[PDB]
Write a protein that binds this ligand. Sequence first.
Ligand code: EMI
Ligand code: ZN
Length: 258
Amino acid sequence: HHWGYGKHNGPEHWHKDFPIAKGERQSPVDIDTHTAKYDPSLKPLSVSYDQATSLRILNNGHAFNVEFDDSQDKAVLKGGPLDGTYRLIQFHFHWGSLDGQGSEHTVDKKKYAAELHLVHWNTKYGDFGKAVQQPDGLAVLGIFLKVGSAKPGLQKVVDVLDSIKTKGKSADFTNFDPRGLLPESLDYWTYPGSLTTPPLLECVTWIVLKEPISVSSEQVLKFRKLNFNGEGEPEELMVDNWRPAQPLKNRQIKASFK
Ligand SMILES: Nc1ccccc1NC(=O)c1ccc(NCC(=O)NCCc2ccc(S(N)(=O)=O)cc2)cc1
Ligand SMILES: [Zn+2]
């Protein structure tokens, strides 16, 4: 009876195994654009992905992860609200059963069709497992997806999904360039928060881009053909793998822009 996104094991249940679910810095949150404060001291984000080395794509039963070689400074996030150098380890998405829901963060209570999370860890902690134990261990770059025109740089991901339909399946996934998933603007909101799935550790500097990317209806339909189940288990479509907005509590969301 493991956590997931169903009626009996979904986000309202998680606090029983992971009491930090009701903590002081949980994610995601609603971004109230009128209460976010412009912070003129915030630096431009530095997204250095030209040497990224993708390795593999994995269906882990909760989402799919595109994994990177994080054994050297090859794809890093710096600047913005961050001190030091954060290495890209993986990206994944959260998405809905319908185009009207799927994002984890909301903007003035608006839900997007999906949300991309580019997960990075602080190199001063040596690897990911140590970084998630620290209040500044991770930086997650969040990008909203809206349904409209196709994102050409997403299609290589969409096309491999039939090879990782079920939980525990992986496939080689080399030479994927995550720059093809970024919007034009790097204007962002930032706040201190958590992992949005168990173990819900309070280790994340969230950086959420203001400008969504557009994907096609056909691209997101292919996300919704994935399965939460393993091969030879009853088929349960991998949809609505999002945690809803959590209380902001004693936090301020800062904006990089006016
Ligand atoms: N060792 C230790 C000591 C004291 C306190 C905590 C820890 N470690 C842990 O709690 C612990 C660490 C990792 C665990 N599992 C693997 C793991 O990497 N999980 C996190 C992956 C994750 C990555 C990104 C996101 S998201 N949606 O916020 O971008 C969500 C989840 C499970 C438990
Ligand atoms: Zn995520």
